[PDB]
Structures are given as structure tokens and as C-alpha cells.
């Protein structure tokens, strides 16, 4: 009923990348 951070990690992994790349043009 746990260990579900793979999807959440994204929201963190996304920002990590989306942080660099130009805003969502």
C-alpha cells in the first residue's frame, strides 16, 4: 500500500529538467 513514489518522483524529476529547459512555451 506504499512504495508509490515512482510517479511522484517524476513531479520532482520533471522540475529538475523542466527547471533548465525554457518555460513551457
UniProtKB/Swiss-Prot annotation:
Organism taxonomic ancestry: Bacteria, Bacillati, Actinomycetota, Actinomycetes, Mycobacteriales
GO biological process, one term: chaperone cofactor-dependent protein refolding
The organism's place on the tree of life at top rank: Bacteria
Gene (UniProt): groES
Keywords, comma-separated and alphabetical: Chaperone, Cytoplasm, Stress response
Protein name: Co-chaperonin GroES
GO MF entry, a single one: protein folding chaperone
Summary of the function given for this chain in its UniProt record: Together with the chaperonin GroEL, plays an essential role in assisting protein folding. The GroEL-GroES system forms a nano-cage that allows encapsulation of the non-native substrate proteins and provides a physical environment optimized to promote and accelerate protein folding. GroES binds to the apical surface of the GroEL ring, thereby capping the opening of the GroEL channel.
GO-annotated cellular components: cytoplasm
Family: Belongs to the GroES chaperonin family.
Statement: the UniProt record of this protein carries the keyword Transmembrane: no
Primary localisation category: cytoplasm
Localization (cell): Cytoplasm
Section covered of the full-length record: 2 to 26 of 100
Species assigned in the record: Mycobacterium tuberculosis (strain CDC 1551 / Oshkosh)
Subunit structure: Heptamer of 7 subunits arranged in a ring. Interacts with the chaperonin GroEL.
